[PDB]
Design a protein around this ligand. Structure first.
Ligand code: NAP
Ligand code: NA
Lengths: 220, 234
């Protein structure tokens, strides 16, 4: 049984990933801010029993890694998926975004994901996979983020920070993935099944990849 | 140029370093330069340029982080159009460049100063930019995802990737660009940010950047280029 850690698993694609990994036979550790308040996560917990361990945790809390670690004990993480993401201000307007909103956006979407992944990295299996939920809107070459520029810039910043982390290693000890889930309203189930296949395709490769739910590369 | 032409060049962040070098280099080409600085009176470099160029160098008090910056620049310009708009001002972020230690206040400061405020300002002045002009943002090779050189200064690099992203998103609002949009890498330059090991003088960096800016005039394109006018990958 692989150990899979999904950070941000109460709903949407995060929950879908927990479900999809469970269906492959993994032991899943599913972190959410309010796990008890997610009927989706509760339903998965009931069905999988002990194979789905819900964990209360918040990416933005500085003790998050410590709490996850204490919970995991000596168990190694085969697949670490950080499914951080907020939209930022609904108007996506550079003229109006304030300091508090800027901090929240870039901490949640870019900085805290790296802080957490780095802090847990000593537990990640060699030849495993660390993946971050990114977006097509992160791509500079595609340049598709005009209607949500702040969101897209936060995901470009995430991609940048992951590339910077890669640059700290002589050779990668695990793969580093930046994931585009597709434009899910495309079901969560199809997206998650695809993303699981993309993640598993990178296991043992120790490569940096920016890929979508079909395992197709996106340009930077 | 001919036809009694004298380009109006606006440099945001011109008190020292590359920004001052750009003001000097544009003045040497014959431009009317509007040099925006937080404390223009406290810059010996800008005072020296003012003495040499007289009225062809107008110092303007202004701060990229202030929401009235565009208004102050506009009031100063009157009805004049901007032929070249260069946003140079930027910060390094925390000295340690460490994702584990940066706090909320520092994160806001970094991304506002290096990414969001440049777009806020440029957008607010964009109606004044000449058709066939150039709007350029000082970016960095550390912004490039393909080069993956950002490990040296990850936070700074991420803030410039965010800048690049926002400029591309702005481009994507136009059916046809009315001016060029440039992301500039100045090289590693001997300034307070670059340090004593930097291989380029301000003078050579600025001369190169002026040539790259002028090479984009009338093209109405997006480019990510260095001080030699060589393209960088995204
Ligand atoms: N030097 C390099 O090697 C290098 C490499 C790549 C990219 N860059 C970029 O090039 C730009 C200029 O770099 P530099 O090396 O010349 O830095 P610098 O010598 O330290 O000068 C920074 C300039 O930015 C101004 N500034 C900072 N924050 C400002 C704000 N809110 N509002 C208005 N002005 C502000 C400063 O004015 P004050 O005097 O008031 O502080 C100063 O004129 C920056 O965007 C930097 O990121 C530099
Ligand atoms: Na003000």
């Amino acid at each position: 049984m692989h150990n899979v850690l999904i950070v941000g698993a109460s709903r949407g694609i995060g929950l879908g990933l927990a479900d999809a990994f469970l269906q492959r036979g993994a032991q899943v550790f599913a972190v959410a801010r309010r796990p008890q308040g997610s009927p989706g996560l509760q339903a998965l917990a009931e069905r999988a029993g002990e194979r789905l361990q819900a964990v209360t945790g918040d990416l933005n809390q500085h003790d998050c890694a410590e709490r996850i670690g204490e919970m995991l004990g000596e168990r190694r993480i085969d697949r670490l998926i950080v499914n951080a993401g907020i939209y930022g201000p609904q108007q996506q307007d550079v003229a109006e975004i304030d300091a508090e909103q800027t901090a929240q956006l870039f901490l949640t979407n870019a900085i805290a994901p790296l802080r957490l992944a780095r802090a847990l990295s000593g537990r990640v299996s060699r030849g495993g996979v660390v993946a971050f939920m990114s977006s097509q809107m992160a791509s500079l070459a595609l340049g598709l983020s005009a209607t949500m520029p702040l969101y897209g810039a936060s995901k470009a910043a995430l991609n940048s920070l992951v590339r910077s982390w890669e640059g700290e290693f002589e050779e990668l000890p695990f793969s580093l993935l930046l994931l585009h889930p597709g434009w899910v309203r495309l079901s969560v189930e199809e997206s998650a099944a695809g993303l699981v296949a993309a993640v598993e395709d990178a296991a043992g490769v120790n490569a940096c990849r920016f890929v979508d739910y079909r395992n197709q590369p996106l340009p930077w």
